[PDB]
Amino acid sequence: MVDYSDCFEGISGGAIFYNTKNKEYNIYNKELIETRRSPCSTFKIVSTLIGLEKGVINSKESVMGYDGTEYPNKNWNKNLSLEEAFKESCVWYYKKLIDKVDAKSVQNILDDLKYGNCDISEWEGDLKNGKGHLNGFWLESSLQISPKEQVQTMAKIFEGDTNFKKEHINILRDIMKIDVNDKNINVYGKTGTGFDEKNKRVDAWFVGMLEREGDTYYFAIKSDDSNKEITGPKVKEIAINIIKKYYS
């Protein structure tokens, strides 16, 4: 067990890095990285592949059709492409995408990926939050997955152990790429932000992978802090600081 607490700056959380070559996990806060939580927008990693496999989308330019709804997040107020929807965490784009897939197809895909509890029973999500259509089973709802399960899923996807086509995995890798001011390492990932109203804790995520030299690490950084200021973007900052101090 490793310690990356310095990079969390007192924020409650954990981190897990997996290297498929030596099959070793670098774990900070074992109990937390084994705890299932809503994946929130990190689910876009899998929903992108589901959309591509089912032909709902076909490329980084794919559009879903914008109905003109004025959303609080002005970055969502246009007919944005798959690459834009992924980077802006556009819930309306991905909810419209998943609504075109049969629940049986989603269930079989998650069960085959061993995606946590694979529970999509609350398809429409937690309507009690008053957000109407800006909800889904992956947003503080029935679907739950641990940080360790996220890393295991990432590894199966990118090491080619799933049924997904390599051309679709390559589209996902492209839209997941992030800039860390260092061409010596390649970082890919997706943020997730939610608040667990029942337990009064955030679900703040940064899930992805690091490619350096001849090594690849699949990682999941997670916060369960009480402070609602702790969002996916904040956990992304912590993840980049962990990568800079312990993986560079």
Residue type, 17: F
- Cβ contact 142:121 at 8 Å: yes
- Cα distances (Å, whole numbers) of residue 248 to 219, 227, 245: 15, 30, 6
With b for 16 or more beta-carbon neighbours within 10 A and e for fewer, the 27-37 pattern comes to bbbeebbebeb
Give the separation between CA 8 and CA 243, rounded to whole angstroms: 13
Domain boundaries, the chain: 2-248
Task: Give the residue numbers annotated as catalytic, written as ranges.
Answer: 41
Task: Report phi then psi at 30, rounded to 5.
Answer: -55, -50
